[PDB]
PDB file of C-alpha atoms and ligand atoms in Angstrom:
ATOM      1  CA  UNK A1179      99.482 -78.743-140.873  1.00 16.36           C
ATOM      2  CA  UNK A1180     100.165 -76.923-143.829  1.00 14.18           C
ATOM      3  CA  UNK A1181     102.469 -79.491-146.137  1.00 16.42           C
ATOM      4  CA  UNK A1182      99.138 -81.697-145.472  1.00 13.67           C
ATOM      5  CA  UNK A1183      97.076 -78.665-146.583  1.00 17.80           C
ATOM      6  CA  UNK A1184      98.409 -77.725-149.796  1.00 15.20           C
ATOM      7  CA  UNK A1185      98.804 -82.422-150.620  1.00 16.43           C
ATOM      8  CA  UNK A1186      94.600 -81.184-150.200  1.00 13.92           C
ATOM      9  CA  UNK A1187      95.091 -78.625-152.548  1.00 12.41           C
ATOM     10  CA  UNK A1188      97.190 -80.605-154.959  1.00 13.65           C
ATOM     11  CA  UNK A1189      94.319 -83.451-154.328  1.00 16.35           C
ATOM     12  CA  UNK A1190      91.134 -81.390-156.166  1.00 12.95           C
ATOM     13  CA  UNK A1191      92.739 -78.797-158.379  1.00 15.15           C
ATOM     14  CA  UNK A1192      95.911 -81.162-159.709  1.00 14.32           C
ATOM     15  CA  UNK A1193      95.998 -78.727-163.087  1.00 16.53           C
ATOM     16  CA  UNK A1194      97.365 -75.828-161.269  1.00 17.68           C
ATOM     17  CA  UNK A1195     100.363 -75.068-158.849  1.00 20.89           C
ATOM     18  CA  UNK A1196      99.529 -74.566-154.853  1.00 19.25           C
ATOM     19  CA  UNK A1197     101.617 -71.976-155.231  1.00 16.26           C
ATOM     20  CA  UNK A1198      99.083 -69.923-157.282  1.00 17.07           C
ATOM     21  CA  UNK A1199      97.017 -69.914-154.529  1.00 17.44           C
ATOM     22  CA  UNK A1200     100.147 -68.007-151.941  1.00 18.11           C
ATOM     23  CA  UNK A1201      99.183 -64.707-153.270  1.00 18.24           C
ATOM     24  CA  UNK A1202      96.075 -64.580-154.749  1.00 22.58           C
ATOM     25  CA  UNK A1203      93.431 -61.205-154.020  1.00 21.42           C
ATOM     26  CA  UNK A1204      93.857 -59.976-150.411  1.00 25.94           C
ATOM     27  CA  UNK A1205      93.066 -63.105-148.877  1.00 23.77           C
ATOM     28  CA  UNK A1206      94.596 -65.838-150.349  1.00 24.79           C
ATOM     29  CA  UNK A1207      98.430 -67.154-148.599  1.00 26.95           C
ATOM     30  CA  UNK A1208      99.004 -63.136-146.624  1.00 31.20           C
ATOM     31  CA  UNK A1209      97.226 -62.202-143.455  1.00 32.31           C
ATOM     32  CA  UNK A1210      93.848 -60.867-144.718  1.00 34.44           C
ATOM     33  CA  UNK A1211      92.461 -57.229-144.433  1.00 36.32           C
ATOM     34  CA  UNK A1212      90.384 -55.871-146.542  1.00 31.34           C
ATOM     35  CA  UNK A1213      86.877 -56.898-149.176  1.00 30.84           C
ATOM     36  CA  UNK A1214      87.274 -60.089-151.282  1.00 30.88           C
ATOM     37  CA  UNK A1215      87.362 -59.929-155.185  1.00 27.86           C
ATOM     38  CA  UNK A1216      86.108 -62.992-156.111  1.00 26.45           C
ATOM     39  CA  UNK A1217      84.864 -66.445-154.859  1.00 25.58           C
ATOM     40  CA  UNK A1218      88.706 -67.831-154.329  1.00 30.88           C
ATOM     41  CA  UNK A1219      89.990 -64.846-152.663  1.00 31.50           C
ATOM     42  CA  UNK A1220      86.250 -65.788-150.384  1.00 27.58           C
ATOM     43  CA  UNK A1221      87.033 -68.959-149.255  1.00 27.38           C
ATOM     44  CA  UNK A1222      91.116 -67.952-148.135  1.00 27.12           C
ATOM     45  CA  UNK A1223      88.204 -65.354-146.044  1.00 27.60           C
ATOM     46  CA  UNK A1224      86.275 -68.232-144.399  1.00 29.88           C
ATOM     47  CA  UNK A1225      89.805 -70.442-144.344  1.00 29.24           C
ATOM     48  CA  UNK A1226      91.012 -67.649-142.277  1.00 25.31           C
ATOM     49  CA  UNK A1227      87.546 -67.155-139.775  1.00 24.17           C
ATOM     50  CA  UNK A1228      87.925 -71.408-139.601  1.00 25.32           C
ATOM     51  CA  UNK A1229      91.535 -71.023-138.444  1.00 27.13           C
ATOM     52  CA  UNK A1230      90.730 -68.082-135.598  1.00 25.61           C
ATOM     53  CA  UNK A1231      87.347 -70.422-134.425  1.00 23.41           C
ATOM     54  CA  UNK A1232      90.485 -73.198-133.566  1.00 24.61           C
ATOM     55  CA  UNK A1233      93.052 -71.179-132.094  1.00 23.41           C
ATOM     56  CA  UNK A1234      89.797 -71.084-129.571  1.00 23.37           C
ATOM     57  CA  UNK A1235      91.012 -74.499-128.215  1.00 22.88           C
ATOM     58  CA  UNK A1236      94.103 -74.486-125.764  1.00 21.01           C
ATOM     59  CA  UNK A1237      96.783 -75.569-127.535  1.00 21.83           C
ATOM     60  CA  UNK A1238      96.073 -75.515-130.595  1.00 20.93           C
ATOM     61  CA  UNK A1239      98.297 -74.122-134.048  1.00 23.22           C
ATOM     62  CA  UNK A1240      96.516 -74.918-137.767  1.00 20.96           C
ATOM     63  CA  UNK A1241      99.786 -74.172-138.927  1.00 19.83           C
ATOM     64  CA  UNK A1242     101.575 -77.259-137.215  1.00 18.17           C
ATOM     65  CA  UNK A1243      99.106 -79.404-135.923  1.00 17.03           C
ATOM     66  CA  UNK A1244      99.094 -82.545-137.707  1.00 19.00           C
ATOM     67  CA  UNK A1245      95.552 -84.543-138.262  1.00 17.84           C
ATOM     68  CA  UNK A1246      94.532 -87.804-140.471  1.00 19.59           C
ATOM     69  CA  UNK A1247      92.629 -86.831-143.486  1.00 17.58           C
ATOM     70  CA  UNK A1248      92.577 -88.599-147.216  1.00 17.50           C
ATOM     71  CA  UNK A1249      93.015 -88.028-150.368  1.00 21.35           C
ATOM     72  CA  UNK A1250      91.372 -90.330-152.263  1.00 23.48           C
ATOM     73  CA  UNK A1251      90.072 -89.928-156.118  1.00 24.56           C
ATOM     74  CA  UNK A1252      88.712 -87.030-155.829  1.00 23.66           C
ATOM     75  CA  UNK A1253      87.327 -86.826-152.069  1.00 24.39           C
ATOM     76  CA  UNK A1254      88.395 -85.543-149.284  1.00 24.85           C
ATOM     77  CA  UNK A1255      88.205 -86.860-145.532  1.00 23.99           C
ATOM     78  CA  UNK A1256      88.811 -85.945-142.579  1.00 26.33           C
ATOM     79  CA  UNK A1257      89.529 -89.421-140.167  1.00 25.23           C
ATOM     80  CA  UNK A1258      87.053 -90.051-136.982  1.00 28.72           C
ATOM     81  CA  UNK A1259      90.831 -90.848-135.812  1.00 29.14           C
ATOM     82  CA  UNK A1260      90.889 -87.245-134.996  1.00 30.03           C
ATOM     83  CA  UNK A1261      91.314 -84.785-131.160  1.00 29.25           C
ATOM     84  CA  UNK A1262      89.249 -81.770-131.021  1.00 27.79           C
ATOM     85  CA  UNK A1263      92.094 -79.394-133.000  1.00 27.03           C
ATOM     86  CA  UNK A1264      92.792 -81.356-135.681  1.00 25.23           C
ATOM     87  CA  UNK A1265      89.047 -82.377-136.174  1.00 26.07           C
ATOM     88  CA  UNK A1266      88.479 -79.213-136.561  1.00 25.29           C
ATOM     89  CA  UNK A1267      92.066 -78.051-138.207  1.00 22.94           C
ATOM     90  CA  UNK A1268      91.394 -81.341-141.031  1.00 21.79           C
ATOM     91  CA  UNK A1269      87.548 -79.656-141.447  1.00 24.59           C
ATOM     92  CA  UNK A1270      89.248 -76.816-142.312  1.00 20.16           C
ATOM     93  CA  UNK A1271      91.349 -77.052-144.890  1.00 20.63           C
ATOM     94  CA  UNK A1272      88.589 -79.293-146.321  1.00 16.77           C
ATOM     95  CA  UNK A1273      86.298 -77.376-146.691  1.00 15.93           C
ATOM     96  CA  UNK A1274      88.903 -74.876-148.686  1.00 12.80           C
ATOM     97  CA  UNK A1275      90.228 -76.736-150.922  1.00  7.81           C
ATOM     98  CA  UNK A1276      87.028 -78.125-151.878  1.00  9.30           C
ATOM     99  CA  UNK A1277      85.741 -74.816-152.237  1.00  8.35           C
ATOM    100  CA  UNK A1278      89.355 -74.112-154.513  1.00  7.44           C
ATOM    101  CA  UNK A1279      87.707 -76.696-156.821  1.00  5.32           C
ATOM    102  CA  UNK A1280      84.593 -74.682-158.245  1.00  6.57           C
ATOM    103  CA  UNK A1281      86.513 -70.743-157.601  1.00  4.22           C
ATOM    104  CA  UNK A1282      87.429 -69.710-160.709  1.00  2.96           C
ATOM    105  CA  UNK A1283      90.896 -68.820-161.045  1.00  4.07           C
ATOM    106  CA  UNK A1284      91.585 -65.219-162.348  1.00  2.85           C
ATOM    107  CA  UNK A1285      95.423 -64.037-163.397  1.00  3.41           C
ATOM    108  CA  UNK A1286      94.070 -60.432-162.678  1.00  3.24           C
ATOM    109  CA  UNK A1287      93.380 -61.157-159.001  1.00  6.66           C
ATOM    110  CA  UNK A1288      96.997 -62.719-158.552  1.00  4.15           C
ATOM    111  CA  UNK A1289      99.971 -61.204-156.958  1.00  3.06           C
ATOM    112  CA  UNK A1290      97.520 -57.873-156.606  1.00  2.43           C
ATOM    113  CA  UNK A1291      99.077 -54.335-154.686  1.00  2.00           C
ATOM    114  CA  UNK A1292      97.206 -54.565-151.930  1.00  2.00           C
ATOM    115  CA  UNK A1293      97.613 -51.313-150.295  1.00  2.00           C
ATOM    116  CA  UNK A1294      95.206 -50.067-153.023  1.00  2.00           C
ATOM    117  CA  UNK A1295      93.419 -53.529-153.849  1.00  2.00           C
ATOM    118  CA  UNK A1296      92.144 -54.275-150.058  1.00  2.00           C
ATOM    119  CA  UNK A1297      91.761 -51.293-147.141  1.00  2.13           C
TER     120      UNK A1297
ATOM    121  CA  UNK B1366      97.420 -57.297-131.481  1.00  3.42           C
ATOM    122  CA  UNK B1367      98.671 -56.767-135.328  1.00  6.60           C
ATOM    123  CA  UNK B1368      96.969 -53.283-134.883  1.00  6.22           C
ATOM    124  CA  UNK B1369      99.470 -52.210-132.451  1.00  6.44           C
ATOM    125  CA  UNK B1370     102.310 -53.232-134.467  1.00  6.16           C
ATOM    126  CA  UNK B1371     100.842 -51.225-137.155  1.00  3.81           C
ATOM    127  CA  UNK B1372     101.085 -47.684-134.800  1.00  3.73           C
ATOM    128  CA  UNK B1373     104.910 -48.835-133.843  1.00  2.12           C
ATOM    129  CA  UNK B1374     105.670 -49.162-137.907  1.00  2.00           C
ATOM    130  CA  UNK B1375     104.507 -45.171-137.579  1.00  2.00           C
ATOM    131  CA  UNK B1376     105.870 -44.237-134.588  1.00  2.00           C
ATOM    132  CA  UNK B1377     109.189 -45.419-136.295  1.00  2.00           C
ATOM    133  CA  UNK B1378     108.778 -45.230-140.125  1.00  2.00           C
ATOM    134  CA  UNK B1379     105.860 -41.849-140.006  1.00  2.00           C
ATOM    135  CA  UNK B1380     106.730 -42.018-143.987  1.00  2.00           C
ATOM    136  CA  UNK B1381     105.161 -45.057-144.849  1.00  2.00           C
ATOM    137  CA  UNK B1382     102.356 -47.217-144.229  1.00  2.00           C
ATOM    138  CA  UNK B1383     102.408 -51.031-143.079  1.00  2.00           C
ATOM    139  CA  UNK B1384     101.081 -52.004-146.199  1.00  2.00           C
ATOM    140  CA  UNK B1385     104.527 -51.008-147.272  1.00  2.00           C
ATOM    141  CA  UNK B1386     105.318 -54.250-145.213  1.00  2.00           C
ATOM    142  CA  UNK B1387     102.717 -55.924-145.774  1.00  2.00           C
ATOM    143  CA  UNK B1388     104.016 -57.097-149.778  1.00  2.00           C
ATOM    144  CA  UNK B1389     107.986 -56.762-149.606  1.00  2.00           C
ATOM    145  CA  UNK B1390     110.266 -59.456-150.389  1.00  2.00           C
ATOM    146  CA  UNK B1391     109.366 -63.294-148.921  1.00  2.64           C
ATOM    147  CA  UNK B1392     108.768 -62.440-145.146  1.00  2.51           C
ATOM    148  CA  UNK B1393     106.730 -59.349-144.554  1.00  2.00           C
ATOM    149  CA  UNK B1394     103.448 -59.706-144.483  1.00  2.00           C
ATOM    150  CA  UNK B1395     102.566 -62.852-143.332  1.00  2.02           C
ATOM    151  CA  UNK B1396     103.984 -65.977-144.753  1.00  3.13           C
ATOM    152  CA  UNK B1397     107.847 -66.526-145.471  1.00  2.35           C
ATOM    153  CA  UNK B1398     109.727 -69.111-147.593  1.00  8.36           C
ATOM    154  CA  UNK B1399     113.073 -68.949-149.190  1.00  7.21           C
ATOM    155  CA  UNK B1400     116.434 -66.263-148.947  1.00 12.84           C
ATOM    156  CA  UNK B1401     115.207 -62.770-147.068  1.00  9.84           C
ATOM    157  CA  UNK B1402     116.112 -61.088-150.865  1.00  8.81           C
ATOM    158  CA  UNK B1403     116.708 -58.221-147.850  1.00  7.89           C
ATOM    159  CA  UNK B1404     117.900 -56.681-144.767  1.00  7.29           C
ATOM    160  CA  UNK B1405     114.290 -55.196-144.286  1.00  7.56           C
ATOM    161  CA  UNK B1406     113.210 -58.956-145.974  1.00  8.10           C
ATOM    162  CA  UNK B1407     115.290 -60.333-143.263  1.00  6.62           C
ATOM    163  CA  UNK B1408     113.865 -58.139-140.397  1.00  3.65           C
ATOM    164  CA  UNK B1409     110.218 -59.721-141.294  1.00  5.99           C
ATOM    165  CA  UNK B1410     112.391 -62.945-141.054  1.00  8.68           C
ATOM    166  CA  UNK B1411     113.173 -63.074-137.603  1.00  9.72           C
ATOM    167  CA  UNK B1412     109.446 -61.343-136.630  1.00 11.60           C
ATOM    168  CA  UNK B1413     108.082 -64.220-137.873  1.00 12.16           C
ATOM    169  CA  UNK B1414     111.072 -66.533-135.172  1.00 11.30           C
ATOM    170  CA  UNK B1415     110.064 -64.383-133.194  1.00 12.46           C
ATOM    171  CA  UNK B1416     106.729 -64.706-132.864  1.00 12.66           C
ATOM    172  CA  UNK B1417     107.239 -68.761-133.459  1.00 13.54           C
ATOM    173  CA  UNK B1418     108.473 -68.841-129.830  1.00 10.09           C
ATOM    174  CA  UNK B1419     105.959 -66.451-128.760  1.00 11.13           C
ATOM    175  CA  UNK B1420     104.133 -68.450-129.267  1.00 11.01           C
ATOM    176  CA  UNK B1421     104.943 -71.540-127.212  1.00  8.16           C
ATOM    177  CA  UNK B1422     103.856 -69.875-124.610  1.00  5.39           C
ATOM    178  CA  UNK B1423     100.201 -71.387-123.355  1.00  8.21           C
ATOM    179  CA  UNK B1424      97.683 -70.058-125.632  1.00  7.00           C
ATOM    180  CA  UNK B1425      99.053 -66.734-126.327  1.00  7.88           C
ATOM    181  CA  UNK B1426      98.023 -65.233-129.360  1.00  5.76           C
ATOM    182  CA  UNK B1427     100.635 -62.843-131.153  1.00  4.90           C
ATOM    183  CA  UNK B1428      97.621 -61.462-133.306  1.00  5.68           C
ATOM    184  CA  UNK B1429      95.529 -60.545-131.523  1.00  3.32           C
ATOM    185  CA  UNK B1430      97.010 -59.821-127.752  1.00  9.38           C
ATOM    186  CA  UNK B1431      96.924 -56.524-126.678  1.00  7.48           C
ATOM    187  CA  UNK B1432     100.524 -55.765-125.237  1.00  9.70           C
ATOM    188  CA  UNK B1433     100.536 -52.045-123.501  1.00  9.50           C
ATOM    189  CA  UNK B1434     102.962 -49.753-124.253  1.00 10.26           C
ATOM    190  CA  UNK B1435     104.085 -45.854-125.567  1.00  9.85           C
ATOM    191  CA  UNK B1436     105.892 -44.726-128.387  1.00  6.34           C
ATOM    192  CA  UNK B1437     106.861 -41.006-127.286  1.00  6.48           C
ATOM    193  CA  UNK B1438     108.888 -38.792-129.497  1.00  5.69           C
ATOM    194  CA  UNK B1439     109.693 -41.785-132.190  1.00  4.84           C
ATOM    195  CA  UNK B1440     110.494 -43.981-129.151  1.00  7.16           C
ATOM    196  CA  UNK B1441     108.827 -47.942-128.480  1.00  8.42           C
ATOM    197  CA  UNK B1442     108.804 -48.704-125.610  1.00  8.26           C
ATOM    198  CA  UNK B1443     107.432 -51.363-123.797  1.00  5.24           C
ATOM    199  CA  UNK B1444     105.678 -50.757-120.361  1.00  7.54           C
ATOM    200  CA  UNK B1445     105.910 -53.344-117.418  1.00  5.37           C
ATOM    201  CA  UNK B1446     101.480 -53.851-116.092  1.00  6.01           C
ATOM    202  CA  UNK B1447     102.124 -56.867-119.198  1.00  6.67           C
ATOM    203  CA  UNK B1448     102.134 -60.332-117.986  1.00  5.12           C
ATOM    204  CA  UNK B1449     104.718 -63.162-119.775  1.00  6.14           C
ATOM    205  CA  UNK B1450     102.617 -62.946-123.379  1.00  5.46           C
ATOM    206  CA  UNK B1451     102.329 -59.511-123.941  1.00  7.72           C
ATOM    207  CA  UNK B1452     106.158 -58.825-122.477  1.00  6.10           C
ATOM    208  CA  UNK B1453     106.934 -61.353-125.590  1.00  5.60           C
ATOM    209  CA  UNK B1454     104.481 -60.251-128.613  1.00  8.81           C
ATOM    210  CA  UNK B1455     104.793 -56.329-127.621  1.00  8.14           C
ATOM    211  CA  UNK B1456     109.194 -56.314-127.797  1.00  9.14           C
ATOM    212  CA  UNK B1457     108.866 -58.497-131.171  1.00  9.99           C
ATOM    213  CA  UNK B1458     107.209 -56.391-133.062  1.00 11.46           C
ATOM    214  CA  UNK B1459     109.161 -53.324-130.818  1.00 13.29           C
ATOM    215  CA  UNK B1460     112.336 -54.842-132.021  1.00 11.92           C
ATOM    216  CA  UNK B1461     110.418 -55.230-135.794  1.00 13.46           C
ATOM    217  CA  UNK B1462     109.480 -51.550-135.978  1.00 17.34           C
ATOM    218  CA  UNK B1463     113.400 -50.575-135.021  1.00 14.45           C
ATOM    219  CA  UNK B1464     114.479 -52.870-138.170  1.00 11.78           C
ATOM    220  CA  UNK B1465     112.633 -51.335-140.369  1.00 13.70           C
ATOM    221  CA  UNK B1466     113.311 -48.371-139.293  1.00 16.41           C
ATOM    222  CA  UNK B1467     116.647 -49.188-139.394  1.00 13.23           C
ATOM    223  CA  UNK B1468     116.075 -51.106-143.189  1.00 13.33           C
ATOM    224  CA  UNK B1469     116.086 -48.806-146.394  1.00  9.71           C
ATOM    225  CA  UNK B1470     113.340 -49.528-148.272  1.00  8.60           C
ATOM    226  CA  UNK B1471     113.864 -51.166-151.647  1.00  7.46           C
ATOM    227  CA  UNK B1472     110.785 -50.678-154.829  1.00  2.70           C
ATOM    228  CA  UNK B1473     111.481 -53.153-156.117  1.00  2.00           C
ATOM    229  CA  UNK B1474     110.867 -55.461-153.538  1.00  2.00           C
ATOM    230  CA  UNK B1475     107.554 -54.600-153.308  1.00  2.00           C
ATOM    231  CA  UNK B1476     105.050 -57.270-154.607  1.00  2.00           C
ATOM    232  CA  UNK B1477     106.997 -59.910-156.587  1.00  3.00           C
ATOM    233  CA  UNK B1478     106.051 -63.256-157.895  1.00  6.06           C
ATOM    234  CA  UNK B1479     106.501 -65.604-154.477  1.00  3.16           C
ATOM    235  CA  UNK B1480     106.482 -68.386-157.036  1.00  3.65           C
ATOM    236  CA  UNK B1481     109.735 -67.092-158.662  1.00  6.32           C
ATOM    237  CA  UNK B1482     112.034 -65.558-155.964  1.00  7.62           C
ATOM    238  CA  UNK B1483     110.472 -67.314-153.029  1.00  9.17           C
ATOM    239  CA  UNK B1484     111.957 -70.581-153.681  1.00  7.35           C
TER     240      UNK B1484
HETATM  241 ZN1  LIG C2948     102.033 -59.772-154.357  1.00  8.18          ZN
END
């Protein structure tokens, strides 16, 4: 779930509050449309599509679904003890979080005017 | 059907685009949090609860479900040929568009810092 997903982000991006990724570019946080503005915003796009692929499974809601994961040292791991849905949602978050650690953060791309920037 | 919801907003508030609602307050756009900040925003929050309810229906994907309705001279009507899911979702969007056309649009509430406004 989200509390799990954001706990992941805290794991690989300790020097930044998750709120920083709640309204970034055209795809981070919000619903998403238009063209990404940077690698980070692109990360979020992939996370969006990942979740939409996780809905293809009966009664599978990424946002509300709970899974089992571990954040040790800076490593994320989704435990084998996961059914199909959880296993996929977790993997989605894991990849998203890791993508957040490498992508550079640009402040000019935070809380931007969507109507003018995304389309 | 996120698209049909856009047509509805236009069918009631021709003077604006959904973009004006894509990033407004704490709840319009997508993920909500904090205090509604506004009647208009309150509309969006209610719109979320509505989807959360509609999502209890088996395999109902509010965002992608294509429902049946018609917009005639400002009037929104969800038609009967819809099934449980389509019917529920159509009604949500339908009530949001009305709630929209009824609430005042505060430009100061467009693009705010969720970090320092929606805690
Ligand atoms: Zn914004």
